[PDB]
């Protein structure tokens, strides 16, 4: 028992992190097989970021201008190309620690682990979610760019995020590993603001199931609701609409606890309208939405990698 914000073990990813320098800019790269992936803004000066023409800036760069260091040892760059907002540096050595891997593009509501890195060295690991406004609420200092987000399926690492930028509201934007930004964000120092940070309803319900499994039961009431009635109330509180597909996804947690999804929706409706009255659920005074149904099943059944 107990329920914690749990990250994937980071060992497989620690083995892929390198340092990339172009002139005075140092950030992180991901070394898989004989390719190093990094944010294309590695080629930019502070001044360049106000209005960069990446194709024009790249013409001034050769292979030998990209300095790649893997734990104190220099890698030889034999090719470079830009794909969307990432640079692909071809190196003459395959990473001997390359895990089985995939590049995925995740949906809002999906969670992943971040390995925060500086100068190609791991600092820490933590769990995030892709927000409905396509930002993440990370922890990233200057130097953190090229840090990656990932999920592990037994022995296979699915890379879903590469860190590029911070919005002045303190939230984070980045790309998939094909270099496409999540959401409308661009790698330019121009006015960009996040949209409404809506709450991931299906994730809140998963976490309420987690609470019941772990004996935290004070919020269970004698009520039920309908999807349409729940969604009338949810919308008022900037919760995402709940769909029949979401109900189906919560099936396993419903079955484990014997509490119908619509009964748990009725408990959530009462928590939204009444508040917590100074009580806590799984050590939180807020409704937590960064656990997916899959995350709850995994943590409550002890799945390993």
Curated annotation (Swiss-Prot):
It is found in: Host cytoplasm; Host Golgi apparatus; Host nucleus. Inhibited by pyridone-containing alpha-ketoamides compounds 13a and 13b. In turn, alpha-ketoamide 13b (tert-butyl (1-((S)-1-(((S)-4-(benzylamino)-3,4-dioxo-1-((S)-2-oxopyrrolidin-3-yl)butan-2-yl)amino)-3-cyclopropyl-1-oxopropan-2-yl)-2-oxo-1,2-dihydropyridin-3-yl)carbamate) inhibits SARS-CoV-2 replication in human lung cells. Inhibited ex vivo by michael acceptor inhibitor N3. Inhibited ex vivo by compound 11a and 11b. It catalyses: TSAVLQ-|-SGFRK-NH2 and SGVTFQ-|-GKFKK the two peptides corresponding to the two self-cleavage sites of the SARS 3C-like proteinase are the two most reactive peptide substrates. The enzyme exhibits a strong preference for substrates containing Gln at P1 position and Leu at P2 position. The active site is at 41 (for 3cl-pro activity), 145 (nucleophile). Residues 1-305 form the Peptidase C30 domain. There is a cross-link at residues 5, 90 (Glycyl lysine isopeptide (Lys-Gly) (interchain with G-Cter in ubiquitin)). Coiled coil: none annotated. Changing residue 189 to A: Does not affect ability to cleave and inactivate human TRMT1. Residues 1-305 are cytoplasmic. Cleaves the C-terminus of replicase polyprotein at 11 sites. Recognizes substrates containing the core sequence [ILMVF]-Q-|-[SGACN]. Cleaves and inactivates human TRMT1, preventing tRNA guanine(26)-dimethylation of tRNAs. May cleave human NLRP1 in lung epithelial cells, thereby activating the NLRP1 inflammasome pathway. May cleave human GSDMD, triggering alternative GSDME-mediated epithelial cell death upon activation of the NLRP1 inflammasome, which may enhance the release interleukins 1B, 6, 16 and 18. Also able to bind an ADP-ribose-1''-phosphate (ADRP). 3CL-PRO exists as monomer and homodimer. Only the homodimer shows catalytic activity. Interacts with host FBXO22; this interaction promotes the proteasomal degradation of nsp5. This is 3C-like proteinase nsp5. The chain holds residues 3264 to 3568 of 7096 of the full protein.
């Amino acid at each position: 028992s107990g329920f914690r914000k749990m990250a994937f073990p980071s060992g497989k990813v620690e083995g892929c992190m390198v340092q990339v320098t172009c002139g005075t800019t140092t950030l992180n790269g991901l070394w898989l097989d004989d390719v190093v992936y990094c944010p294309r803004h590695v080629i930019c000066t502070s001044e360049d970021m106000l209005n960069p023409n990446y194709e024009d800036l790249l013409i001034r760069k050769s292979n030998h201008n990209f300095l790649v260091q893997a734990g104190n040892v220099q890698l030889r760059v034999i090719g470079h190309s830009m794909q969307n907002c990432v640079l692909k540096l071809k190196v003459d050595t395959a990473n001997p620690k390359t895990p089985k891997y995939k590049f995925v593009r995740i949906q809002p509501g999906q969670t992943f682990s971040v390995l925060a890195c500086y100068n190609g060295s791991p600092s820490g690991v933590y769990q995030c979610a892709m927000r409905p406004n396509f930002t993440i609420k990370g922890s990233f200092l200057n130097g953190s760019c090229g840090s990656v987000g990932f999920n592990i399926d037994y022995d296979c690492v699915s890379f879903c995020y590469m860190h590029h930028m911070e919005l002045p509201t303190g939230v984070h934007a980045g790309t998939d590993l094909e270099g496409n930004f999540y959401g409308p964000f661009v790698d330019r120092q121009t006015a960009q603001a996040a949209g409404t940070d809506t709450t991931i309803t299906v994730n809140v319900l998963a976490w309420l199931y987690a609470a019941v499994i772990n004996g935290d039961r004070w919020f269970l009431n004698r009520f039920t609701t309908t999807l349409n009635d729940f969604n009338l109330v949810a919308m008022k509180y900037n919760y995402e609409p709940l769909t029949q597909d979401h109900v189906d996804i919560l099936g396993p947690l419903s079955a484990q606890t014997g509490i119908a999804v619509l009964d748990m929706c009725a408990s959530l409706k009462e928590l939204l309208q009444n508040g917590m009255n100074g009580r806590t659920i799984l050590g939180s005074a807020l409704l937590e939405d960064e656990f997916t149904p899959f995350d709850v099943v995994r943590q409550c059944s002890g799945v390993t990698f």
